[PDB]
């Protein structure tokens, strides 16, 4: 997250930190995710497409820091890694960038709700917030394009939803963005999601209710003028989400 502020997991209880195990014992951060139900985490397919091995992933819930433990956090293995069949990636754009991760603890149990661990509501069929609506994003992603390391503390920022028409302009993304995607950015181009924030949530207060409106998917650079963040439109994937869960 470029700009924005440091926050704690208590403020983003549905946030899931996904790591990959390596040979030797070195674990590295992969992407963000969201707890949609006690046993299910939703993320982006591009995060796992190159290494589809469920055994190599570790999902953390209730975690505020990247490389240190947080009181009340819970560790989970991945029981089932469901990637979208029609996933494809063009020059910039990622299509059908959505993934489901069925989680289970060592004891075979799912997530147990607490002050630092909660689920987020999915949207209604084709019912998104009107454009111009403010939404928040969270992640352990880069703070600047020039950084090679990720921030140690979780961050968040607020961005505004941009209409499909505006995002399809020539100077923006043109015909690369589709109706299955959502654009969002800071009107002043100061804050934005970046590398590392992928798979994380785009949360919008819809009709007095926190709703998972999008999943961080792609963008040209980070916080660049006329280059909004692009998110997977959760409302258009409800049939797919329900059929696999």
Ligand X SMILES: N=C(N)NC(=O)c1nc(Cl)c(N)nc1N
Residues that are catalytic: 46, 97, 198
Q: Is 203 left (phi over 0), alpha (psi -120 to 50) or beta?
A: beta
Nearer to ligand X, 57 or 231 (CB): 231
Binding site for ligand X (CB under 6 A): 192-195, 197-198, 216, 218-219, 221-222, 227, 229
- 8-state DSSP, 240: H
Closest approach of Cβ 235 to ligand X, in Å?
19
Q: How many CA atoms lie within 13 A of 8 on its CB side?
A: 8
Instruction: Please list the residues that pair with 95 across neighbouring strands.
Output: 88
* CA gap 58, 189 in Å, rounded: 34
Query: Any idea which residue has 């983003």 for tokens?
Result: 12
Nearer to ligand X, 136 or 192 (CB): 192
With contact defined as beta carbons under 8 Å apart, do 33 and 42 qualify?
yes
Closest approach of Cβ 107 to ligand X, in Å?
34
User: Terminal CA-to-CA distance of the chain, rounded, Å?
Assistant: 30
Q: Is 188 left (phi over 0), alpha (psi -120 to 50) or beta?
A: alpha
* Residue 234: strand, helix, or coil: helix
Closest approach of Cβ 207 to ligand X, in Å?
26
Closest approach of Cβ 141 to ligand X, in Å?
7
Nearer to ligand X, 71 or 146 (CB): 146
Q: Dihedral angle at the C-alpha atoms of 37, 41, 42, 44, nearest 10 degrees?
A: 180
Closest approach of Cβ 181 to ligand X, in Å?
12
Nearer to ligand X, 201 or 219 (CB): 219
């Amino acid at each position: 997250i470029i700009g924005g502020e440091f926050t704690t997991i208590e403020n983003q209880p549905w946030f899931a930190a996904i790591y990959r195990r390596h040979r030797g014992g070195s674990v590295t951060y992969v992407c963000g995710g969201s707890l949609i139900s006690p046993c299910w985490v939703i993320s982006a397919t591009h995060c796992f497409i190159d290494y589809p091995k469920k055994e190599d992933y570790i999902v953390y819930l209730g975690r505020s820091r990247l490389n240190s433990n947080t009181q009340g956090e819970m560790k989970f293995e991945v029981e089932n890694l469901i990637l979208h069949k029609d996933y494809s990636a063009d020059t910039l754009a990622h299509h059908n960038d959505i993934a489901l991760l069925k989680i289970r603890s060592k004891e075979g149990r799912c997530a147990q709700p607490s002050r630092t661990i909660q689920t987020i509501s999915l949207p209604s069929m084709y019912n998104d917030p009107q454009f111009g609506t403010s939404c928040e994003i969270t992640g352990f992603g880069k703070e600047n394009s020039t950084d090679y390391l990720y921030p140690e503390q979780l961050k968040m920022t607020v961005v505004k939803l941009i209409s499909h028409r505006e995002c399809q302009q020539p100077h923006y993304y043109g015909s690369e963005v589709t109706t299955k995607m959502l654009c969002a950015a800071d009107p002043q181009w100061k804050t934005d999601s970046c590398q590392g924030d992928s798979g994380g949530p785009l949360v919008c207060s819809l009709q007095g209710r926190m709703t998972l409106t999008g999943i961080v998917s792609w963008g040209r650079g980070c916080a660049l003028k006329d280059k909004p963040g692009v998110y997977t439109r959760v409302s258009h994937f409800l049939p797919w989400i329900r059929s696999h869960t």
